[PDB]
């Protein structure tokens, strides 16, 4: 039916990349 478990796990691992970049940008905008 839907996408697999591997694709959801890969998407979460990829979403860690804008999470880290967003943390750096939000801290830079404050700095």
């Amino acid at each position: 039916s839907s996408i697999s478990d591997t694709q959801v796990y890969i998407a979460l691992v990829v979403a860690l990349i804008p999470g880290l970049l967003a943390w750096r940008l939000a801290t830079e905008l404050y700095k």
Binding site: I3, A11, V14
Partner: protein
């Protein structure tokens, strides 16, 4: 499933996971041929993605991962 009948199939927004639902509520939102309780989408994203050429769930998946990397770029 919405591809083969856009006129009679209700689009799904996302799933519901809510522990506050009683069993009649869980039954009431198990709709549009879904396995569990879901919300119906009313934003027309199915009509737009179907019109511009998307046909499978994997194409929607690669779109979402591409937008994750595109947001990483910005």
């Amino acid at each position: 499933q919405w591809i083969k009948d856009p006129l009679h199939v209700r689009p799904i927004a996302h799933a519901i996971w809510d522990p506050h639902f009683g069993k009649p509520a869980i039954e009431a939102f198990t709709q549009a041929g879904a396995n569990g309780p879901v919300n119906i989408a009313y934003s027309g994203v199915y009509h737009w993605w179907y019109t511009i050429g998307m046909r499978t769930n994997t194409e929607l998946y690669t779109g979402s991962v591409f937008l994750l990397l595109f947001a990483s770029l910005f």
